[PDB]
Curated annotation (Swiss-Prot), chain B:
Residues the record lists as Phosphoserine modifications: S50
GO molecular function: structural constituent of ribosome
Assigned GO CC terms: mitochondrial inner membrane; mitochondrial large ribosomal subunit; mitochondrion
Family, per entry: Belongs to the mitochondrion-specific ribosomal protein mL55 family.
Full protein name: Large ribosomal subunit protein mL55
Protein's organism: Homo sapiens (Human)
Biological process annotations from GO: mitochondrial translation; translation
Subunit architecture: Component of the mitochondrial large ribosomal subunit (mt-LSU). Mature mammalian 55S mitochondrial ribosomes consist of a small (28S) and a large (39S) subunit. The 28S small subunit contains a 12S ribosomal RNA (12S mt-rRNA) and 30 different proteins. The 39S large subunit contains a 16S rRNA (16S mt-rRNA), a copy of mitochondrial valine transfer RNA (mt-tRNA(Val)), which plays an integral structural role, and 52 different proteins.
Localisation per UniProt entry: Mitochondrion
Residue range from the parent sequence: 35 to 95 of 128
UniProtKB/Swiss-Prot annotation, chain C:
Modified sites of kind N6-succinyllysine: K130
Protein name, entry field: Large ribosomal subunit protein mL48
Name of the coding gene: MRPL48
Entry GO CC: mitochondrial inner membrane; mitochondrial large ribosomal subunit; mitochondrial ribosome; mitochondrion
Full protein: residues contained: 48 to 212 of 212
Keywords carried by this UniProt record: Mitochondrion, Ribonucleoprotein, Ribosomal protein, Transit peptide
Record family assignment: Belongs to the mitochondrion-specific ribosomal protein mL48 family.
Assembly: Component of the mitochondrial large ribosomal subunit (mt-LSU). Mature mammalian 55S mitochondrial ribosomes consist of a small (28S) and a large (39S) subunit. The 28S small subunit contains a 12S ribosomal RNA (12S mt-rRNA) and 30 different proteins. The 39S large subunit contains a 16S rRNA (16S mt-rRNA), a copy of mitochondrial valine transfer RNA (mt-tRNA(Val)), which plays an integral structural role, and 52 different proteins. mL48 is located at the central protuberance. Interacts with OXA1L.
Subcellular location: Mitochondrion
GO biological process, one term: mitochondrial translation
This protein's record includes keyword Transit peptide: yes
Organism from which the protein derives: Homo sapiens
Top-rank lineage group of the source organism: Eukaryota
From Swiss-Prot, chain D:
Residues recorded with modification N6-acetyllysine: K168
Self-association and partners: Component of the mitochondrial large ribosomal subunit (mt-LSU). Mature mammalian 55S mitochondrial ribosomes consist of a small (28S) and a large (39S) subunit. The 28S small subunit contains a 12S ribosomal RNA (12S mt-rRNA) and 30 different proteins. The 39S large subunit contains a 16S rRNA (16S mt-rRNA), a copy of mitochondrial valine transfer RNA (mt-tRNA(Val)), which plays an integral structural role, and 52 different proteins. mL46 is located at the central protuberance.
A GO molecular-function descriptor: structural constituent of ribosome
Protein name: Large ribosomal subunit protein mL46
UniProt record similarity statement: Belongs to the mitochondrion-specific ribosomal protein mL46 family.
Organism: Homo sapiens (Human)
Disulfide bonds: none
Compartments where found: Mitochondrion
Record's keyword terms, sorted: Acetylation, Mitochondrion, Ribonucleoprotein, Ribosomal protein, Transit peptide
GO biological process: mitochondrial translation
GO cellular component, one term: mitochondrial inner membrane
From Swiss-Prot, chain F:
Entry keyword set: Chaperone, Mitochondrion, Ribonucleoprotein, Ribosomal protein, RNA-binding, Transit peptide, Transport
Annotated function: Together with thiosulfate sulfurtransferase (TST), acts as a mitochondrial import factor for the cytosolic 5S rRNA. The precursor form shows RNA chaperone activity; is able to fold the 5S rRNA into an import-competent conformation that is recognized by rhodanese (TST). Both the cytoplasmic and mitochondrial forms are able to bind to the helix IV-loop D in the gamma domain of the 5S rRNA.
Subcellular location: Mitochondrion
The protein's assembly and partners: Component of the mitochondrial large ribosomal subunit (mt-LSU). Mature mammalian 55S mitochondrial ribosomes consist of a small (28S) and a large (39S) subunit. The 28S small subunit contains a 12S ribosomal RNA (12S mt-rRNA) and 30 different proteins. The 39S large subunit contains a 16S rRNA (16S mt-rRNA), a copy of mitochondrial valine transfer RNA (mt-tRNA(Val)), which plays an integral structural role, and 52 different proteins.
GO molecular function: 5S rRNA binding; structural constituent of ribosome
Biological source species: Homo sapiens (Human)
Official protein name in the record: Large ribosomal subunit protein uL18m
Gene expressing this chain: MRPL18
GO cellular component: extracellular space; mitochondrial inner membrane; mitochondrial large ribosomal subunit; mitochondrial ribosome; mitochondrion
Single biological process term from Gene Ontology: translation
Amino acid sequence: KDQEAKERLKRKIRKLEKATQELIPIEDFITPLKFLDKARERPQVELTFEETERRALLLKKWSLYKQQERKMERDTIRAMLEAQQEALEELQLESPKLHAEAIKRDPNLFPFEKEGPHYTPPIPNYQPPEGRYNDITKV
Amino acid sequence: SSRASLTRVHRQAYARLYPVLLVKQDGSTIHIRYREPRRMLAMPIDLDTSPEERRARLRK
Amino acid sequence: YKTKPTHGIGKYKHLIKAETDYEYGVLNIHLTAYDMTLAESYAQYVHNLCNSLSIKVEESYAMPTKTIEVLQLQMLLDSVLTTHERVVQISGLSATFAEIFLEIIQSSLPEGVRLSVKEHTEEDFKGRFKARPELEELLAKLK
Amino acid sequence: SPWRLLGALCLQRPPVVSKPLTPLQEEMASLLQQIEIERSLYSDHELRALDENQRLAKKKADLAQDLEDMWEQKFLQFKLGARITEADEKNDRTSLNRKLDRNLVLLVREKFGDQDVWILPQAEWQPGETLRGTAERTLATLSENNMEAKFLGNAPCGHYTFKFLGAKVFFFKALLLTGDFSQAGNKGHHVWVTKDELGDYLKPKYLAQVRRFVSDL
Amino acid sequence: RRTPPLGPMPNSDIDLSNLERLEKYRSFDRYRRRAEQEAQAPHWWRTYREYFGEKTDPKEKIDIGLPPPKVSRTQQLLERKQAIQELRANVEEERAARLRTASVPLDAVRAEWERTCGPYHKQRLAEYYGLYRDLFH
Amino acid sequence: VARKERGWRTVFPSREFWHRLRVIRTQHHVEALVEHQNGKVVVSASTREWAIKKHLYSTRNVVACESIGRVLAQRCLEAGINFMVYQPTPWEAASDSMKRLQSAMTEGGVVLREPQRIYE
RNA sequence: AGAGUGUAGCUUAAACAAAGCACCCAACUUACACUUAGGAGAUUCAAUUGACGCUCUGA
């Protein structure tokens, strides 16, 4: 009884470990079953020539804007990198050990946590109403 | 900066997602696209360690 | 032909892949936000700028979303919200380069986002698969 | 060969509110909302509204509006936070309330025997210590309050020398998580400032190299 | 047995210790372009070219003929840039392009072609048909 | 009656022709070249050329490609070329730009099919 | 204040011209990538020689 039970246990555990673990489905890549109803469909207002022209002009202007943004981003990052590397090579020339010390990593710098900006700053004295939250998830 | 915020919904068969405000416990305000055209949600608070302080906030 | 100088002209297997400090293991980047579209767009921006910087990128995937119901008990009122989570895996980022990398990411970070950056752990990798309870029951039986 | 080596910390506070959008980006956001409502699918709100309107139409021959009215009323009643405070921009330059949209950095009142200079804080390095050590040492010496600047990198951010005999300062960079303005009466006038106003403040050309180094964004 | 390579073997310039940092052929078209470029590049080993190619002498073909006029390249490029400036300044061309309804005067294009760079094309056609090799050897 | 190099069945560009059309779509301009089997060019058209680009708005659009096609058909009728071949890739052929190019050349009076060699 | 330098980001590309590469927006794609369809770019001025911009070297 003892040996048999232990062997069955261990073997079943080994089989489960060697089983191909499935992946939890993502609800974002699954269209709700209640999205295919033909009663929802909306009338499509045909677009005007002038409105479509405005759309295209806006799109191309924004493309120009974004390429300018990435140009200035390139400029900033290149300047920062070259300046950092100049400082680094100067420190290497001066102190031949502190440059290696700086090149050394540090674990406390890997785990970071930060929030994003807000539409408005926090109010000094603001309390919300009394309520509670509850998470809902499936397998 | 914040530039990649305004975007197209990179998904087919997407329902109505209307803009609404979201209020954190700290009073911070954030934009959130949500189903129905509401104007603000607010996050409450539940738990504290001080029993008498919990009772006080319940009174007030 | 072997004897002739033209030997080895066609071989390609050595061209293609076969199948301390300043050496950073595979790092993971979690991005949690209420707006799936904002999260996806930010992850796409990050992936594109990484490809531009020629920094290696193992894979990017979505963690299981989750919906939370919040109810105010002054009278009973209810509401619901959702939270989406994206994840990226990178490697090979230099020491000094990581500084400006993270700095530019923080600067271009848009509102409504919470980003974490950590070392990739088996815990994260196993938190994706279904929490199969069968193994837990068998383990308890063993105990 | 009289030399001297200094380490300095440059903390950068990120803004808490988004940038004020360009009109280009504004009309493109409006256009994106338009395209989204055009190519979007129905929601429960639209379902209930439309089918209740149809029920009313049927019952005439035989709610969503109230909810949105109540929500608009709540929105109008609610008070939002203030973005810009011109009063603080004028008389409270040593504060955060003046600008929440762009990143901030401080400046200290420094004095030297050879030349009085309005520059960024620094400190003297001694052998048994790291440059980052000197950095947080300057931080603890100047802060005198409940604020910590979280570091981001061990590498050097700036190299700047000057002679009289020779002094060489190395700048590291750091992130500010928290910050106050207690002990308001200080000798060193610590003042959070942006890049353009910093340029207006201080002259030097090693500092101009600092200007071209630091990111505008 | 083995013999040393006569010339520099292909794919030798690249490095193998570093492989993932390298940039790859993201596109069949990129690979194809590089392929034909190296194809028309000469080679020391035996190839299709020295069997089915005509083997024209290495010396250029002699011509004591009419030289081109001395056109001021600066003013020429300036006038061209002003023409295209006024073109982009025009208003209907973007609609015509994005609706795919435009055309071009064939006669004007032909005249300007035969004025500017026609003779080169005609020389090419002549040496293709072999008029030069047959007439002037 | 000429002999065309039949073979290269494993390789994509088939040498089984007499006059081939090669189109090049760069990031700036568009080139089209009618050439002989030997690799020698017969006739050319290019958006880089002034006589053609003076008119145009963009050197890369469908309008540009179809104009190049019409001009190259006119030049083929100039040089006597009326039969010729075109080796497109799948997506290259699926692209509507050179689709309209081919159509325009056909209305111009050129067929993109080479007659089968005669010999009994 | 003195030395060097100088085509859009790269190219010892330069007649028939400012070419190729790189890059950007959209679409497919989880995303990248590919592909399609669209987008902006320059040789500072006077005759290779000088004078407007750039780096370095000093206070």
